[PDB]
Design a protein around this nucleic acid. Structure first.
Lengths: 56, 158, 99, 144, 139, 114
RNA sequence: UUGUGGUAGACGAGCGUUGUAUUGGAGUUGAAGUCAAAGCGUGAGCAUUGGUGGAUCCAAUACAAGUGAGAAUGCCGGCA
RNA sequence: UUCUCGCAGUCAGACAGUGGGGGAUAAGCUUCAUUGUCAAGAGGGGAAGAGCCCAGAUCAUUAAAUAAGGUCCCCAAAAUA
RNA sequence: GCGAAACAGUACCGUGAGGGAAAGGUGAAAAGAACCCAGAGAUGGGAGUGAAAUAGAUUCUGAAACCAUAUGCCUACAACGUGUCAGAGCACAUUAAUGUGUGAUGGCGUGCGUUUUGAAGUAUGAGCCGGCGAGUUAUGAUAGCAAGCGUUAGUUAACCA
C-alpha cells in the first residue's frame, strides 16, 4: 500500500546512508603510464607484457 | 463584484464522487482574477450634514480667535493699484511683511484683477472672496490680511 | 564565619565577602542597610531571632530577570491569552556582622 | 531570590560492601540492598546523577522466607513466543537459581530509569561463600 | 587563493552528482581523474571535465602551485527544473518533472580554508560588535 | 483603497518561530506547527513552575532525613523537637545546606535535644 | 478593604497597515523591503548596529477604509 | 436576585448521592424531582477519567502550616503499645 | 487592476453553441564582454568596459517549505506528541546580560481547529510554504453618548449660484 504518515527527512537520510559508492580498485600498467582497472586492459593494450587490441 | 465580471456559470466538476472540493463558479473570491465579495461602489454620498447655526457659531469663533492675534493686519484699496499684476512688487511686499515662511490668506470685497493675477504663481498665499472663505482656510493661514471695507459685512454676517 | 540571614521573603547562607540576591527594598545603591532579622549566628541559638543582632550590608546593583511569556491555552475551545512578567531584584553582598 | 542549591558534579567515590545472608528474609534483605545501592541515606544524595555503592552478597541459597510461600509464591517468566511461560516455585528457585531471585528482587524496586540498568550492575551474589572481588579489597558490614 | 569553477544546466539527477562528489571530495588532483573517470556513472564524465577546467584555471588564471592543491568541496544543487506531462491509463493526467542540477567544484592550496571562512565570520561579528560599541558611545 | 498585510505578518511569524529554538525536527521551521509546539512548551513550563517547587521540597526533606540517619533518631521526632520546644523558624533548605560545612549542623542536632 | 479560572455573549480600555490634512525631520555622508542579534514593554508590538539595496521615508495629532489569516476535503504558483 | 429600558446567546445534557416511575429494584438505560460536579474549571488522593473526595489556579520566589489520602521501596513522610 | 500592461479573445480544449490562460522591469548609456586558458561545443575562469559584473542577458528587490557543505556540541542497552524544570561535561565571549551554544543524567507529560453529554482519538479538517481569501455600502427606524438652537421652538428637501 502507501504510507499513512509522511516520511521525514531523517528517515530518507537514514535510508540513503548506504548510498555511498565503493572506491573501485585501480592498477598501473607496466608499459603505458596510466591508472587502469584491475585484471583489465588499459587504453594501449598490453594487459601484461602481451598485447591484444590495435590502438584503442 | 462577483456577478458583474464575465465568466462561466458552469460547475467545473461534478459535485460528488470527485477528489476536489465543492467549489462552484470559477469567478468566486477563492479563484484569482476578481470576484471581490465586498467593494466600494460609485454611489456613496459621503456628506456630513451639520446644522446652519453650528456652522455660523464656528465661523464667528474662528474669526474672533484669529482676529485678536498679532499676525493679522488691515489692507486698504489704495495699494491694490500700487501693486500691479506683476509679482515683483508683491514679492517685495511679502519680504517687507516678513511673510516669506507664512501662509497668509487674503480676504477682500472688491476682487481686483491686479491682486488676483499676482500670488497665483505662489502656493504660500491666495486671494478669496468673503462668500467663499471657509473655516479650514480661515484657520490654516495662521495670519490674515483683511480689507477694512469687509468689516461692515463681517459684523452684519454675525 | 557561617551565618544565616533572613531578608525579603527567604533566608540565605552568608560567608565572608559573599554576595546574594533578594527582592527590592526601595533602597538605592550606596546606603548600608543593617539587616536585623537574622537567625542562628554560629554558636548561638535564639528561638524567634537573635536579640540585637544585625549584619551590615551595602547594596550592589539593581537587576531585572529574563522575560517569561506565560501562555495559558484552553484546548479545543475558543480561548487564547498571553502574559509577560519581569521580577525586579537587588544584588547585595555582606561586609560585616556582629556577635 | 535563591541560594543556588548545591548539586553533585559526578563525584563518584564508591566503597565496597559485603553483607552476610545468614538466614535473612528476602524482603528486608532486598529493601536494605536497594537502600545501600541507591545511596538514599547518603548525606548529600542527588537522584539526578549516579552516586551509589557496590554490594557483594554471600550465601544466596541460604536466604529463607516466612509463611507458606514455599508452595504458594510462584514466579512467572515470559518469552515473546506464545506459550512460553516458565513457572517456578520458591523452593525450586532456592535450589536452581537463587542468585536470579535476589537479583530480580533488588532490580524490581529500582526506579524505572535509564540508570536502572546501570545501577543494578553494582550488585553481585554467590551461591557459596567464595567471591572474586578480593582484588578490590572490600570492607564488610552486617545487616545492610 | 580559492580559484573555483562553476557549471550550469547539467542534465543529471542531483543525488548521483552528490554521491560522486562525496566519493571524490577530500583528495588531490592526480588521483582525482583516476578515481573519477573509472566508475560507471554518467555524472562522473562531466565532473572530469569540470575538474580539468578547475585545474587549468588554478594553474593559469591565478598563479597557484601544481602539486599542493587539492579538491576542497564538491556539491550538487537542484538547478532550474522543467515540467512536462505524460499520459496515464483511463485518460489520467500527471505532471512529470524533468530534473536538472548545478555542479561546482572548489580547489585549495593548503589544508586551511576550513578556518579562513571562520576567520571572515569572526571578522564580520567583530565588525558588528564594534558598530554596536560605537553606537553606544554616542551618549 | 486596498491594503495588503506583508510586513506585520512576517514580523509576527518570525517572532513566533524564534521562540521555537532548540527543538527537534521541522518544528523549528514550520510556523503552523512551531506555534503549537511553543504553546505546549509554555503550558509545560507553567506546570513545571509548580512541579519544581514540589520536587525541591521533596529532595530537601529526603536529604534532611538522610543526614538525620547518622544520629539515631527519625525525621518526624526531629521536626517535633524542633517545633514543640526550642522553636526555630529555620529553612529546611538551609538545614540541608548546613552539611557543606561539616559538624556545624551537628551542633543543632545536639542542641535541639532539651 | 474587597476582588481579578472561564467557552457563547454583553461591555470598556488599546496596538498595527494604507492614504489625505497639516505642523517638525531624515534622505548616494545611504530610506524602504529584506537577512542575522546573546535588547525594551501588562499587549496586539517597538529600538539598535552589521551585510544586502539603490530612492523615498519617519515622529506626533485627526479623518476614511478592499485593514490583522490556521484550516474552508479552499485558489493559483513553487517545493518536499 | 425587585423595576422600565439597549443588546444577547442558550431549546442534543451527562454523571455521583437521595425518592419514586418504566425495566425484572439490568445496564455507563430511559423518563422526573432533588443535592452537587462537569458542563463553561487547574492541582492533589483514587494507577491511569467529566462527574468520586479536598477546591478555587492574577504572576514570579529553590519559603512556612494544614485539607482529602498516605508513611518498607517505587513515590513524600513513623514510631510506640 | 477591464478576463486582455508583453503582436490576448491570442496560445490552448471542445466537430458546437462555447470555455478560457500564464508570464512586465539589466544597465545612465550595451559600453552586451577583444583577447588567453580548460573543454569539440555550450559554458566557465582570467582580461577589459562600466560607480558596482553578487547589474552578464537565469537579466530590480531575492524571505519558505528544498537540499547540499562546514566550524562548535551530543548520540549506536535504547520505550520517544520529543518540550519544561534542575543539572554537569564541552567550547566560546555578548545590544554586560545573576552571558551564550549543546545536552551525558534526573522529575513530569497523550497536539491544533471544528462539531460536540463528551476528544490523544479507534470521529473529523489540514503536506509544507508564500500570497489572495467574509459582517461593508445605499435608503429608513429605535436606543445610548455628544453638539447647535433654545420654549410660538428647530429644520430645510428638490433646486439656482
Amino acid at each position: 500500500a502507501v504510507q499513512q504518515r509522511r516520511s521525514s527527512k531523517h528517515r530518507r537520510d537514514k535510508r540513503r546512508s548506504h548510498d555511498a559508492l565503493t572506491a573501485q580498485a585501480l592498477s598501473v600498467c607496466q608499459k603505458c603510464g596510466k591508472k587502469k582497472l584491475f585484471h583489465r586492459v588499459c587504453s594501449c593494450g598490453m594487459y601484461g607484457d602481451l598485447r591484444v587490441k590495435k590502438a584503442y | 463584484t462577483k456577478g458583474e465580471v464575465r465568466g462561466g456559470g458552469k460547475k467545473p466538476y461534478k459535485q460528488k464522487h470527485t477528489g476536489k472540493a465543492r467549489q462552484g463558479s470559477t469567478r468566486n473570491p477563492h479563484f484569482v482574477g476578481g470576484g471581490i465579495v465586498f467593494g466600494p461602489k460609485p454611489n456613496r454620498n459621503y456628506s456630513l450634514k451639520l446644522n446652519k447655526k453650528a456652522h455660523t457659531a464656528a465661523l464667528h469663533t474662528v474669526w474672533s480667535e484669529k482676529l485678536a492675534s498679532d499676525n493679522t493686519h488691515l489692507v486698504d484699496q489704495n495699494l491694490f493699484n500700487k501693486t500691479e499684476g506683476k509679482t515683483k512688487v508683491m514679492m517685495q511686499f511679502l519680504k517687507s511683511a516678513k511673510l516669506l515662511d507664512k501662509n497668509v490668506l487674503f480676504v477682500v470685497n472688491t476682487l481686483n484683477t491686479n491682486l488676483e493675477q499676482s500670488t497665483s504663481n505662489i502656493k504660500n498665499v491666495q486671494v478669496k472672496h468673503l462668500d467663499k472663505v471657509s473655516v479650514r482656510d480661515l484657520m490654516l493661514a495662521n495670519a490674515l490680511l483683511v480689507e477694512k471695507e469687509v468689516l461692515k459685512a463681517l459684523e452684519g454676517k454675525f | 564565619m557561617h551565618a544565616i540571614v533572613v531578608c525579603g521573603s527567604k533566608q540565605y547562607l552568608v560567608h565572608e565577602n559573599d554576595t546574594f540576591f533578594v527582592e527590592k527594598l526601595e533602597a538605592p545603591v550606596g546606603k548600608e542597610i543593617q539587616l536585623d532579622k537574622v537567625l542562628m549566628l554560629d554558636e548561638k541559638i535564639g528561638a524567634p531571632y537573635l536579640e540585637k543582632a544585625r549584619v551590615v550590608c551595602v547594596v550592589e546593583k539593581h537587576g531585572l530577570q529574563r522575560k517569561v511569556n506565560v501562555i495559558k491555552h484552553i484546548s479545543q475551545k475558543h480561548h487564547l491569552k498571553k502574559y509577560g512578567h519581569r521580577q525586579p531584584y537587588t544584588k547585595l553582598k555582606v561586609v560585616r556582622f556582629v556577635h | 531570590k535563591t541560594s543556588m542549591l548545591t548539586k553533585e558534579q559526578a563525584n563518584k567515590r564508591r566503597q565496597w560492601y559485603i553483607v552476610d545472608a545468614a538466614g535473612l528474609v528476602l524482603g528486608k534483605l532486598a529493601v536494605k540492598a536497594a537502600d545501600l545501592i541507591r545511596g538514599k541515606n547518603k548525606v548529600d544524595f542527588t537522584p539526578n546523577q549516579d552516586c551509589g555503592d557496590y554490594l557483594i552478597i554471600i550465601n544466596s541459597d541460604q536466604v529463607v522466607l516466612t509463611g507458606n510461600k514455599k508452595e504458594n509464591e510462584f514466579w512467572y517468566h515470559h518469552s515473546q513466543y506464545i506459550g512460553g511461560i516458565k513457572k517456578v516455585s520458591g523452593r525450586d528457585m532456592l535450589k536452581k537459581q537463587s542468585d536470579k531471585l535476589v537479583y530480580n528482587a533488588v532490580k524490581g524496586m529500582l526506579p524505572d530509569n535509564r540508570l536502572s540498568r546501570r545501577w543494578i550492575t553494582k550488585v553481585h551474589v554467590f551461591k557459596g561463600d567464595k567471591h572474586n572481588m578480593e582484588a578490590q579489597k572490600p570492607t564488610t558490614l552486617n545487616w545492610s | 587563493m580559492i580559484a573555483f569553477a562553476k557549471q550550469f544546466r547539467v542534465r543529471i539527477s542531483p543525488q548521483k552528482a552528490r554521491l560522486v562528489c562525496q566519493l571524490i571530495v577530500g583528495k588531490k588532483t592526480a588521483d582525482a581523474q583516476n578515481i573519477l573517470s573509472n566508475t560507471p556513472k554518467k555524472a562522473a564524465t562531466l565532473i572530469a571535465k569540470l575538474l580539468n577546467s578547475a585545474i587549468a584555471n588554478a594553474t593559469n588564471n591565478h598563479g597557484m602551485n601544481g602539486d599542493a592543491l587539492y579538491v576542497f568541496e564538491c556539491v550538487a544543487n537542484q538547478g532550474p527544473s522543467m515540467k512536462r506531462t505524460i499520459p496515464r491509463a483511463k485518460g489520467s493526467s500527471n505532471m512529470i518533472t524533468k530534473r536538472s542540477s548545478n555542479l561546482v567544484v572548489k580547489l585549495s592550496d593548503n589544508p586551511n580554508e576550513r578556518q579562513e571562512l571562520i576567520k571572515q565570520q569572526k571578522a564580520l561579528v567583530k565588525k558588528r560588535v564594534e558598530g554596536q560599541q560605537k553606537a553606544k558611545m554616542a551618549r | 483603497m486596498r491594503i495588503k498585510g506583508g510586513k506585520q505578518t512576517r514580523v509576527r511569524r518570525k517572532k513566533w518561530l524564534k521562540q521555537a529554538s532548540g527543538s527537534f525536527g521541522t518544528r523549528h521551521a514550520s510556523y503552523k506547527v512551531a506555534k503549537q509546539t511553543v504553546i505546549q512548551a509554555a503550558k509545560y513550563a507553567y506546570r513545571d513552575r509548580r512541579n519544581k517547587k514540589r520536587d525541591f521540597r521533596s529532595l530537601w526533606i529526603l536529604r534532611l532525613n538522610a543526614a538525620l540517619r547518622e544520629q539515631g533518631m527519625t525525621y518526624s521526632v526531629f521536626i517535633n523537637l524542633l517545633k514543640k520546644h526550642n522553636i526555630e523558624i529555620n529553612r529546611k533548605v538551609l538545614s540541608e545546606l548546613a552539611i557543606k560545612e561539616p559538624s556545624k549542623f551537628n551542633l543543632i542536632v545536639q542542641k535541639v535535644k532539651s
